Amino acid sequence: MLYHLFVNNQVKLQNDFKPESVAAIRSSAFNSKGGTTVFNFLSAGENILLHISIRPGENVIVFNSRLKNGAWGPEERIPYAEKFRPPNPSITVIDHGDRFQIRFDYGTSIYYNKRIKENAAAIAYNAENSLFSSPVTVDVHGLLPPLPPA
Amino acid sequence: MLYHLFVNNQVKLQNDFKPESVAAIRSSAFNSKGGTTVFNFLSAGENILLHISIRPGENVIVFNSRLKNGAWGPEERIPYAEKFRPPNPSITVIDHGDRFQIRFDYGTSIYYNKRIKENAAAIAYNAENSLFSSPVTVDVHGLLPPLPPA
Amino acid sequence: MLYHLFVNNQVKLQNDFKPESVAAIRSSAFNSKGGTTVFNFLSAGENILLHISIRPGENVIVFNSRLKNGAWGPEERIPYAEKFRPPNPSITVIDHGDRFQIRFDYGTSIYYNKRIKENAAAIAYNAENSLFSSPVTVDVHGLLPPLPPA
Amino acid sequence: MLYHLFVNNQVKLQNDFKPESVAAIRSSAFNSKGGTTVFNFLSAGENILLHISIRPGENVIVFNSRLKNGAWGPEERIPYAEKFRPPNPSITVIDHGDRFQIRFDYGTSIYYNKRIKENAAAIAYNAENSLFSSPVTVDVHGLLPPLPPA
Numbered sequence A, B, C, D: 001m002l003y004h005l006f007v008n009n010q011v012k013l014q015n016d017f018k019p020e021s022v023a024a025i026r027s028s029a030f031n032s033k034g035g036t037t038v039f040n041f042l043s044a045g046e047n048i049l050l051h052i053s054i055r056p057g058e059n060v061i062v063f064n065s066r067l068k069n070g071a072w073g074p075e076e077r078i079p080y081a082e083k084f085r086p087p088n089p090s091i092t093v094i095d096h097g098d099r100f101q102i103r104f105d106y107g108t109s110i111y112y113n114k115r116i117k118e119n120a121a122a123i124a125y126n127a128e129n130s131l132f133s134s135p136v137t138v139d140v141h142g143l144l145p146p147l148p149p150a
């Protein structure tokens, strides 16, 4: 399923993002002078199951969760440098049941253990000066599709 | 290369659309009651090398070409019905040197013998009431990519 | 559909190779010091609809056709040097209805007009000492499948 | 990287199968009467990091590990039913660092937690009379490849 996720807006998944689900987010730009950019996987109740805060002007990428209302739990950060590849950077999220696997364009996958027991019913994209394009292309799979040779 | 082509707008290709190039256009919604929807592969001088006029109201899809300052050539026509797959219909275009191959979701491909000897420097998307989404995802390749087993 | 076409053998297709069909042949090796290597697409009556004779020594790649009991027709050739990429060289045959497109690893593809009005029922492979592996992997599609972003 | 893995034989990997690596194993046939079929991921020391024994008879698929000069540890087994899709059944193995993800054609992924802290340098295939074709097509990736929209 293909969705066009607009900045500071969101898309409702026609199907729950759950174990086996694969979400491939791709950007057609990558704005160097851009700042903090966020992607959130939302439960039906709109709790932030997976929060991805890309902070260029701070060389860090923060991963967290929190009830829509609640405060933020412990952060799980990793360096920002050498993660994305211009001009078409991307972010791939996979639901492995007990944790999320997140991959950028370079480096090893980041594994984020689930903290909130709910499937994602939507994906939000927030940014005041996004590092990416608006919208960003988003393909969501129910399962891992047959892979090409390269 | 990923581009986001908005309705009644266009996109400048990083490299020219030439022999071997593949363009994969994908929509995110498919509006069953949308009107005439067009896609134009434009040369540097704005010549319409390939014109794809999807006309649901006339149940036909028209292919043609014309120099910016010239007139349309004869029309290439094929039935519209049962060509697109909702909710994410697609259109693939491939430059085979002497002619373009156009594939939708179902049916046989369409071949349209080039009439202007030029490469494409951009692709336009036009519609007052479009069948597809704005924008449409467009992946441009320099050659056929590794094919998946499925 | 995946097949393992062994050298000096052939594989019977579960469905006819016809317009829109895609045969992606891949080798696990490139025995550069090899010799003449051939791939043939045969119809039910056993006519050779498409003959591809790769000759490293002569430094050319011959394309031809011939009926079951007939002599070869005129040849259509191209230089062989560097048309294949090690360690996994590939050949991709696509039926465009009136002609086949033959894709190697390098250089613009080659088109061959159909001489025999039949669909192929088997793909053959012959060689005294192949330039490729035995077998070669062959994925046959009824139509071009969705293309990955790259 | 493509390899043709023959039954009762193995293929020496170009690069180490390590975290991020993906191995797509595909067969051209499905021998319904076939007996126990095994695939082993081996360390340079020839220790069996991942052992996968498919037993149609006992309706089970066994996963284990052992040292070259060793006996089998406790078995992790799952039902054989609803895993393979003939005539081209597959098996995808992915190294997630602490564990291997294992996918067949049907059902949810299987996770086998690593027992031997070594990267695999080879992949073996053995059986008396295989359930799968000989050889099987194996595409090994250093990291997940770009995904087709569908």
Ligand SMILES: CC(=O)N[C@@H]1[C@@H](O[C@@H]2O[C@H](CO)[C@H](O)[C@H](O)[C@H]2O)[C@@H](O)[C@H](CO)O[C@H]1O
Pocket (backbone or CB within 6 Å): A051, A053, A062, A064, A072, A073, A075
């Ligand atoms: C340093 C700063 O100015 N603010 C930090 C906060 O950052 C927020 O982090 C959450 C996720 O943890 C989210 O990304 C939000 O958009 C950020 O502003 C946070 O780390 C804490 C309090 O939440 O304070 C500062 O560390």
Ligand SMILES: CC(=O)N[C@@H]1[C@@H](O[C@@H]2O[C@H](CO)[C@H](O)[C@H](O)[C@H]2O)[C@@H](O)[C@H](CO)O[C@H]1O
Pocket (backbone or CB within 6 Å): B051, B053, B062, B064, B072, B075
């Ligand atoms: C009916 C009408 O107003 N115009 C018809 C022509 O339509 C144009 O067709 C070109 C491509 O050939 C292009 O799509 C343009 O936007 C259309 O207005 C044409 O279809 C026919 C053929 O002679 O003539 C006009 O009736």
Ligand SMILES: CC(=O)N[C@@H]1[C@@H](O[C@@H]2O[C@H](CO)[C@H](O)[C@H](O)[C@H]2O)[C@@H](O)[C@H](CO)O[C@H]1O
Pocket (backbone or CB within 6 Å): C051, C053, C062, C064, C072, C073, C074, C075
């Ligand atoms: C060089 C040689 O020994 N024979 C040449 C011919 O080769 C045959 O070509 C047919 C297809 O055209 C087929 O490949 C057969 O197996 C080949 O032996 C032919 O290529 C040329 C004609 O230019 O004549 C011979 O030199």
Ligand SMILES: CC(=O)N[C@@H]1[C@@H](O[C@@H]2O[C@H](CO)[C@H](O)[C@H](O)[C@H]2O)[C@@H](O)[C@H](CO)O[C@H]1O
Pocket (backbone or CB within 6 Å): D038, D051, D053, D062, D063, D064, D072, D075
């Ligand atoms: C003993 C025998 O001939 N077959 C079965 C055993 O097979 C071995 O099991 C190990 C354990 O993983 C490994 O698969 C080895 O390659 C096999 O030969 C064994 O699976 C079971 C008891 O665990 O007994 C026999 O059914």
